[PDB]
Amino acid sequence: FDSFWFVQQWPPAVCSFQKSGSCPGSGLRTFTIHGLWPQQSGTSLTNCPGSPFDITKISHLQSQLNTLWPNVLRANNQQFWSHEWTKHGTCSESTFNQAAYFKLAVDMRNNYDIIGALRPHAAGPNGRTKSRQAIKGFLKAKFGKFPGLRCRTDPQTKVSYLVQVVACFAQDGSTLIDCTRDTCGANFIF
């Protein structure tokens, strides 16, 4: 892998697509970790042959992960961590063992406060229309690099909602780099 996509999700937005049933994200007004996705030549590396997920390897990060990486769709964090490790983490296992991978994600989350970066610009989530360019600009100014903005469209209304913010990192997992790929259009609800 040559870079990482540190993907954070806005729980309420992610859960806003679940039109029925419980969804913990609905009550979590803080960006949380969706996953840390290794990339290679402009593409996501997934399902690489690697070590099976081992929950004991991250007991030391468990409390932090419960807060920073909760499963926002259902009350089962481990299932989500295991899925993210197996589908993505294995792809950077050449240099980051499971413990180091989850630690990277935790550190990245603790060093990439999106709400804190948007607050000064009154660009926090309020269910109103936001500019992709403006949001990327605020984050570019705060962190020095452009984030990636990911949106999902409500099939019934055609309204686009910001669901994830990506912080791109070099293979060292510490050097923030500019993201260039967004799934969001020029405007979206946040």
Ligand X SMILES: O=c1cc[nH]c(=O)[nH]1
Check binding of 181 to ligand U5P (CB under 6 A): no
DSSP 8-state symbol, 16: H
Determine the residue type at 151.
Answer: C
Nearer to ligand U5P, 5 or 190 (CB): 5
Which of positions 28-57 make contact with ligand U5P (CB under 6 A)? Answer: 34-35
84 assigned to active site: yes
Which of positions 136-165 make contact with ligand U5P (CB under 6 A)? Answer: none
User: How far is the C-alpha of 112 from the C-alpha of 32, rounded, in Å?
Assistant: 11
Exposed, middle or buried by CB within 10 Å (0-12, 13-18, 19+), for 151? buried
Contact 34, 9 (CB under 8 A): yes
Given 16, 71, 90, 98, the residue binding ligand U5P (CB under 6 A) = 71
Nearer to ligand U5P, 77 or 187 (CB): 77
Check binding of 84 to ligand U5P (CB under 6 A): yes
User: How far is the C-alpha of 11 from the C-alpha of 149, rounded, in Å?
Assistant: 15
Rounded (10°) angle between helices 77-87 and 98-110 = 110
Residues that bind ligand X (CB under 6 A): 5, 37, 39, 42-44, 181
Residues that bind ligand U5P (CB under 6 A): 14, 34-35, 71-73, 80, 83-84, 87-88
